[PDB]
RNA sequence: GAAAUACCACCCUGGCGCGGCUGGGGGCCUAACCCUCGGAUGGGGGGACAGCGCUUGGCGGGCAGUUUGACUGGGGCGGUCGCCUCCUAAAAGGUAACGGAGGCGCCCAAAGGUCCCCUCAGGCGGGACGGAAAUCCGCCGGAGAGCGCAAGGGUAGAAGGGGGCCUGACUGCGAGGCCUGCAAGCCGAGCAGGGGCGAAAGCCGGGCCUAGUGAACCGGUGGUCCCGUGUGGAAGGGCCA
RNA sequence: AGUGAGGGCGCGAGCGAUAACGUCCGCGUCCGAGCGCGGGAACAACCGAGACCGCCAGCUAAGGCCCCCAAGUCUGGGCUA
RNA sequence: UGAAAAGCUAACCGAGCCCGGAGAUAGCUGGUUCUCCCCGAAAUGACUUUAGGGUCAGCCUCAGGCGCUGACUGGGGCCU
RNA sequence: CGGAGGCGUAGGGAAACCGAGUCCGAACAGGGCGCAAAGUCCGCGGCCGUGGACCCGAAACCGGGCGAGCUAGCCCUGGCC
RNA sequence: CCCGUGGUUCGUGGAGCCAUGGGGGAAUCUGGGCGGACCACCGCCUAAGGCUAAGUACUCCGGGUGACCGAUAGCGCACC
RNA sequence: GCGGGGGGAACCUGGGGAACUGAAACAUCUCAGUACCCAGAGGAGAGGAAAGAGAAAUCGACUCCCUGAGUAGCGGCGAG
């Protein structure tokens, strides 16, 4: 009966501050290919896209 | 695989920094420079295959 | 859409270092005994 | 001579001695096993084999269960499906079309830094080996030659041509903006550590710029030295690169 | 919450034969989805016009007034026959 | 089975008929019900084994708050 | 009446943990805040997720049975030409 | 204990314990599996036999109650 | 001289054990150990005194309810 988040989601990053938000590793590109190099590698803080992150939310709601 | 192969720099056992590079013209010749997070800057060296 | 850095592996038995947020403010503002309360006495306490 | 010689050391190339390990194969049986005898529980033929149990590798439609893309002035066959540039976007920006055109899925170890110098093609006139066109002299020139690579923008007040010295084609990072609904991709003063080009006023966090690009999973390696399912460690594993 | 395909007309480029109630995009209107009234014979999108409901009331669009059918077989000046 | 075309197999088995999974599945069609009042959609974007589907963007409605901020107009820069 | 609980009551982090502070970090620069601005429960209701979830609608796949007085075959056994 | 497999929140994995199909192939309480793949610890339990009550299931059959139905709903079936 | 067998709507134990549909394809996966064939003990069987739990120098048969988190986690880490 209890739904329970795209557990998956909760798992793959997918984090919330009960304030009303979430984030995933900047994940812009990184930790994958990258015969890239430096400065580019400057993107690993965290990030969050609004609008959309609702589904995410309620799917989750209950734990993570 | 082409005269373009990827290497990267490491420094006197006290770190390693990265970046790709090539193969063509002077091939192997690979000292270079760069600076690790070792100490404050430091040679580094480069090479590392 | 994204690698990840949070991995909670093959298991089920973690340790502890009890992080229960308690407040000297609820405490002294109006629900205490300025010297001895202890986890034990915190039931009413909204920090358990 | 590349070496020095006795007699004592270890170590090999190569063949034979003997010994522990174990790989290859050739002979009637025999008692399990099979067929068995032909009129009987005893005889007969085969017999360590293959029958057969399990694990092994491999043939393998005979069988099973799926799939074998979208666009497109029908379907299919034909085209074609990512990115840069120009046109049509009609003047902000910005838009199809089986509309026009045309390139890229490299690299450049130094076209990466900075300091110092220089400065086009082509026209003309005069000249050794020339000899429509090198090389040098003499004038002339919104710079149309030039900048790996296509276009377009720019632009020799050089980003362009030459010399010196050097790695920032740095880590930590960034405020604040381009565009975009998603994610993208993209622009960046300035603070820190840390260096390099000048003495320095400062430039340098790759190139003259707009294409050389790919989530997520999965797994590798160089860390790290965070976690370990009683504790010490460890298989294993979390974040970095 | 619903459409995620639509068509027409005018202007501006494609294309197509500068052909089609063709198909491509854009500025506008449109028509659906109101676009139910006038209307041009009758005609989803061409000019007029937005209908909450009445009137055995009057002024008007467009576009009309010999008749079929409301409205001058007006006047004035021509030109075709 | 089958002197085999894909034949016949309780009157139409190119894989029988009854019951069962089951009310399979159904971006496809149908059908989708009292009165009245307000507003008023789009029939486009973006990637999609999607392309008559869908997630997000564009337009709508009811509620809070901002409350003169809007289309359009006047004027004067700096853009074509 | 039953007081195992689940939601609040700081959170920040992959964690070690720190703690209203915080991870990056050697960085005084950013992002999660701090900001309580209390929720928590019962109901009524717009509303998804699982369950057939506006309703009846198919090709068919799978299990267990049902039949050679269906039909073709083959076996046994008389007859007729 | 080797591989071949079942369980289990485990789908192949660092993957444990019980459980068995193959081959190996033993210990009597200093015994032996179990906590941590595994190794050094402490701890745990005592395996490879046996018996059954009691608390949740089920509905043929009986009783009773129903903001559960009225003869096309109700079991299809209110009566050969 | 005994026993069984033969039944029985549902519950029940073990025996053996499937496509759909989902994963908008679908081969791991999925429905699921679900449907169904079976054998069998009952009036209820099932399980039922620990080579258990769990790490506190702790508990103590087995079964069923509420809670334990839908977390701990299993995985074309995707539907689930």
From Swiss-Prot, chain A:
Top-level taxon: Bacteria
PROSITE patterns found in the cross-reference section? RIBOSOMAL_L35
Keywords recorded for this protein, A-Z: Ribonucleoprotein, Ribosomal protein
Biological process according to GO: translation
Q: Does the keyword Magnesium apply?
A: no
For this chain, one GO molecular function annotation is: structural constituent of ribosome
Query: Which InterPro entries does this entry report, sorted A to Z?
Result: Ribosomal_bL35, Ribosomal_bL35-like, Ribosomal_bL35_CS, Ribosomal_bL35_sf
Please name the Pfam families in this protein's record.
Ribosomal_L35p
The terms describing its cellular component in GO are:
cytosolic large ribosomal subunit
Q: Which family does it belong to?
A: Belongs to the bacterial ribosomal protein bL35 family.
Q: What NCBIfam families does the annotation carry?
A: rpmI_bact (TIGR00001)
In terms of HAMAP family, this protein maps to:
Ribosomal_bL35 (MF_00514)
The protein's name: Large ribosomal subunit protein bL35
From Swiss-Prot, chain B:
Single GO molecular function: structural constituent of ribosome
Q: Which SUPFAM superfamilies match?
A: Zn-binding ribosomal proteins (SSF57829)
Q: What is this protein called?
A: Large ribosomal subunit protein bL33
- Stated family: Belongs to the bacterial ribosomal protein bL33 family.
Key words of the record? Ribonucleoprotein, Ribosomal protein
PANTHER family from the entry?
50S RIBOSOMAL PROTEIN L33, CHLOROPLASTIC (PTHR43168), LARGE RIBOSOMAL SUBUNIT PROTEIN BL33C (PTHR43168:SF2)
GO CC, alphabetical: cytoplasm; ribonucleoprotein complex; ribosome
GO biological process annotation, one example: translation
From Swiss-Prot, chain C:
Q: Which domain of life is it from?
A: Bacteria
* Annotated function: Binds to the 23S rRNA.
Instruction: Give the family per the record.
Output: Belongs to the universal ribosomal protein uL15 family.
Q: How does it assemble?
A: Part of the 50S ribosomal subunit.
Protein name in the entry: Large ribosomal subunit protein uL15
Q: Which organism is it from?
A: Thermus thermophilus (strain ATCC BAA-163 / DSM 7039 / HB27)
| Encoding gene (name) | rplO
Q: Which residues of the full protein are shown?
A: 55 to 102 of 150
